[PDB]
Amino acid sequence: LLKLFTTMELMRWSTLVEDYGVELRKGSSETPATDVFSSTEEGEKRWKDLKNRVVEHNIRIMAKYYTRITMKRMAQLLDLSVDESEAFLSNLVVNKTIFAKVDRLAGVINFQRPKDPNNLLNDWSQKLNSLMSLVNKTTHLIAKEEMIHNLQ
Amino acid sequence: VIDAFRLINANMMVLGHEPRQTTSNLGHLNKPSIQALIHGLNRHYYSITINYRKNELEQKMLLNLHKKSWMEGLTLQDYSEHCKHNESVVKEMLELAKNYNKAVEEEDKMTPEQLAIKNVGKQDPKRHLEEHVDVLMTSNIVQCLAAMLDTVVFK
């Protein structure tokens, strides 16, 4: 249960519920089946929340890692329809769980800010500066490796 | 501020013997701290000449600063930062501008104390507005010039 969420990979509720259903509910604590908070009967009240959490997490990882994905691919993972996802998207962004913009076409999800001149500008400076720091550092290591004891 | 003394007695100064002994000197006199120091100096042997043994190899060592100038000449910052600088200066320039109108209309006065009160001559809008255009121009040129240079060369 810990290992799946920690590794950022795309998943879906449909598989997640069935599997964990057998593990968590069965799990011997001190010794009994009971542990609650998404395991047993009482645990079911908390479990409902777990579904919502999978869908906030799927949209988050895809947002961070990718910059564009289609809305049809996104829905399959979340286990929503487009009309259902769209409602959910309006409230998520307001709390600031994620930043994402979805359309009605289901052509695309822009997980970046729209292509305005400032983002392009910003990246272009950062790319330049990193190279210059790296070329300096490598020359210092290289100098020892070359000369050495002067046995070669 | 360095001085040299061999140090010889008071009488030698008084007689006027002490300049006969110094020959092969030029001498000099400076005053870090008033008449009391001058008197102390005269009693001693006053300033006997200091020459320096120096040359270009030693001179080159002292010259240095940073080889790190190599990385720095090329470096330019994030574009958001370029914008911060430009904004801060234009905003600043607005404040001083209102005095500037008066400055050009008047300033018949050439007497520094009177001018200061009259057309806000002290805290002058001319000095500062010029100073401001000049930082903004130079800053924008070096940042812009570097970004472009790096682009062509690395790829």
Side-chain angles (χ1 to χ4, degrees):
Chain A
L1 182 60
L2 205 143
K3 179 177 65 181
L4 256 284
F5 288 90
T6 37
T7 53
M8 291 171 178
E9 66 179 54
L10 33 80
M11 57 185 97
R12 64 189 61 210
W13 175 246
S14 293
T15 294
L16 291 157
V17 59
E18 183 74 272
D19 65 272
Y20 286 137
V22 174
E23 290 163 286
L24 305 189
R25 192 179 310 113
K26 186 183 298 302
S28 286
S29 293
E30 282 183 56
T31 197
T34 309
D35 176 64
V36 183
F37 320 114
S38 182
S39 312
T40 45
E41 290 76 48
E42 286 179 283
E44 292 303 296
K45 303 305 184 306
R46 275 290 190 99
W47 191 305
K48 296 190 274 171
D49 305 280
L50 192 61
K51 185 179 176 291
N52 176 84
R53 266 56 193 198
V54 162
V55 300
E56 297 182 85
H57 195 209
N58 296 322
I59 198 184
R60 176 196 167 214
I61 57 167
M62 289 201 274
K64 292 188 295 171
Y65 293 111
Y66 309 144
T67 56
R68 290 176 304 110
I69 187 172
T70 199
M71 211 185 180
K72 296 194 191 64
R73 176 46 175 173
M74 177 273 264
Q76 288 192 141
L77 300 175
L78 272 73
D79 294 285
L80 299 176
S81 288
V82 286
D83 292 86
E84 299 179 28
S85 296
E86 270 182 80
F88 175 56
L89 236 314
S90 293
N91 68 96
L92 285 165
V93 302
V94 167
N95 291 114
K96 219 82 173 157
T97 290
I98 49 81
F99 156 49
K101 292 199 187 280
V102 294
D103 45 43
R104 187 69 178 182
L105 293 169
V108 65
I109 305 187
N110 300 91
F111 291 139
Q112 47 163 114
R113 60 186 281 177
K115 291 278 180 41
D116 295 334
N118 285 302
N119 47 103
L120 189 282
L121 278 170
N122 285 143
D123 281 300
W124 176 34
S125 299
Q126 293 164 62
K127 283 171 173 179
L128 309 171
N129 65 48
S130 296
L131 293 172
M132 312 168 192
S133 290
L134 206 51
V135 290
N136 173 258
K137 177 76 150 63
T138 183
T139 291
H140 301 318
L141 283 299
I142 288 159
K144 183 216 307 170
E145 289 168 2
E146 293 181 274
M147 287 308 280
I148 66 167
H149 301 274
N150 296 266
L151 301 179
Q152 76 167 120
Chain B
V1 168
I2 47 169
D3 275 344
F5 300 94
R6 202 168 38 106
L7 187 55
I8 45 268
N9 300 290
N11 73 82
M12 317 290 191
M13 179 251 285
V14 167
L15 188 48
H17 191 67
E18 191 175 68
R20 317 179 178 152
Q21 303 173 285
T22 209
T23 43
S24 310
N25 177 50
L26 163 54
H28 289 314
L29 177 56
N30 36 80
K31 276 171 60 182
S33 304
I34 68 166
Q35 309 281 296
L37 179 155
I38 306 168
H39 181 55
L41 246 78
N42 290 336
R43 191 202 166 278
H44 315 155
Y45 194 17
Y46 57 80
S47 318
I48 202 288
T49 320
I50 313 178
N51 305 265
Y52 313 116
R53 272 293 183 254
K54 54 193 198 178
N55 42 266
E56 303 186 321
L57 288 178
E58 304 186 311
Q59 271 185 196
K60 171 174 287 295
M61 288 280 92
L62 299 181
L63 183 63
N64 307 339
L65 297 170
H66 282 102
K67 168 190 172 182
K68 299 332 164 168
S69 293
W70 289 3
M71 188 195 294
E72 297 167 78
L74 303 177
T75 300
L76 66 312
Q77 290 286 267
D78 191 47
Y79 239 83
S80 302
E81 292 172 63
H82 304 354
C83 306
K84 285 277 154 292
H85 300 330
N86 296 343
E87 182 183 315
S88 307
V89 186
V90 289
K91 191 55 157 172
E92 180 60 53
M93 281 206 289
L94 179 59
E95 308 310 288
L96 308 142
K98 41 157 183 55
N99 312 309
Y100 225 176
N101 288 88
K102 299 188 302 202
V104 294
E105 208 208 75
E106 300 291 300
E107 306 179 322
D108 298 292
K109 286 296 184 188
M110 285 299 158
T111 15
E113 246 56 52
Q114 304 195 314
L115 187 63
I117 297 168
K118 192 178 186 304
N119 295 121
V120 64
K122 276 188 185 315
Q123 292 64 63
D124 223 6
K126 337 197 75 77
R127 296 196 302 105
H128 299 335
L129 291 166
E130 183 67 70
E131 171 197 271
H132 301 331
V133 297
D134 190 19
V135 291
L136 191 51
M137 176 73 94
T138 184
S139 183
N140 277 321
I141 280 302
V142 302
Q143 283 180 130
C144 175
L145 168 62
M148 288 282 192
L149 178 61
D150 292 296
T151 302
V152 57
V153 156
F154 279 107
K155 182 162 62 181

